Amino acid sequence: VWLANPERYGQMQYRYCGKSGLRLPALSLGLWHNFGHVNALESQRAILRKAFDLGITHFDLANNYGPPPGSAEENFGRLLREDFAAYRDELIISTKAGYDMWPGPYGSGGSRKYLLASLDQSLKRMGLEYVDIFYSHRVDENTPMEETASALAHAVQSGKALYVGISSYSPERTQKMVELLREWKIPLLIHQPSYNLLNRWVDKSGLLDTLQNNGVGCIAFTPLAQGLLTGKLTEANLNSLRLLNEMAQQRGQSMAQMALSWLLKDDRVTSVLIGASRAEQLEENVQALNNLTFSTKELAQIDQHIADGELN
């Protein structure tokens, strides 16, 4: 019998997702790594329990997370049944379809076949009646967005997803998906782009404007550039990373914490989607919330060191 921390909602920051009434935790946990059948279930269990005890209420999955593909969703479903029986309604669970999942022409892409068949498999693996958020995981340029949109609408209409989202769509495609979903009277909830201090296509492309103009949330994935922004590649690269680490030290933050605080420095990002291989990493990362302020000078110096090391 497991009891979650009664103070779990006392310290975490929650942000409204775009114009919706759904509040996401400022840090969410992704299950891309460390939740496959290659990882011991006890290690996974400790991570999920610590995340919920820190008030992280959003867990982000996809069909092909593991390895092997599907295993994160299965393991998550097991831990849900064992430790989160009483807590499902306090969690926001997402899954996605778009990348290679199973063999053949219906195992990848953006067709109605793949999306709806995949959603069913994901709900069965996780033991859920519905996900909170179902995503088109990437752009499929060979499926008309009308078809992808109508699949997402069917997920909602049928009660298999409460809300829908997209991931790695250009601003123009995002705008088209908002419009197609509006024809079904469904608001696009959220957009999940890769976004970190060293990868700012989101800024440069004008995505954040499209999102804000349409009331769509933003959840940043690989916010630590998969560990590059943690301190653990040319000479100028390393020297810049060293200087960024020194800025983080000046702020009283690890490099990881400053990378997260930077994404969260303004309202433009709803949540950052962190990974963890152990509970202590969650404890460190959520402390990013203790220092979300950057001076104009700091923001310039950060961009400058990135310019100087050619980390763009």
Ligand X SMILES: NC(=O)c1ccc[n+]([C@@H]2O[C@H](COP(=O)([O-])OP(=O)(O)OC[C@H]3O[C@@H](n4cnc5c(N)ncnc54)[C@H](OP(=O)(O)O)[C@@H]3O)[C@@H](O)[C@H]2O)c1
State which residue, 266 or 280, has the beta carbon closest to ligand X. 280
Instruction: Give the list of residues 6+ apart from residue 148 with CB closer than 8 angstroms, or none.
Output: 110, 111, 112, 115, 136, 140, 177
Q: Summarize as ranges the residues that interact with a second copy (CB under 8 A).
A: 1-4, 8-9, 14, 16, 19-23, 25, 36-42, 45, 55, 57, 68, 71, 86, 89-90, 92, 102-107, 109-114, 116-117, 121, 132, 140, 142-144, 146-148, 150, 154, 157-159, 162-163, 183-185, 187, 215
Q: Binds 98, which of a second copy, ligand X, none (CB < 5 to 8 A, cut-off by type)?
A: none
Q: Binds 132, which of a second copy, ligand X, none (CB < 5 to 8 A, cut-off by type)?
A: a second copy
CB of 211 to a second copy, least distance (A): 16
Question: Is 185 marked within a binding site?
Answer: no
Question: Is 224 marked within a binding site?
Answer: yes
Q: Binds 225, which of ligand X, a second copy, none (CB < 5 to 8 A, cut-off by type)?
A: ligand X
CA distance 242 to 248: 10
Q: Summarize as ranges the residues that interact with ligand X (CB under 6 A).
A: 30-34, 60, 137, 167-168, 192, 221-227, 230, 232, 256, 273-277, 281, 284-285
Strand partners, 272: 27, 220
Question: Is 194 marked within a binding site?
Answer: no
Binding residues for NADP(+): 32, 60, 65, 167, 192, 222, 224, 226, 232, 277, 281, 285
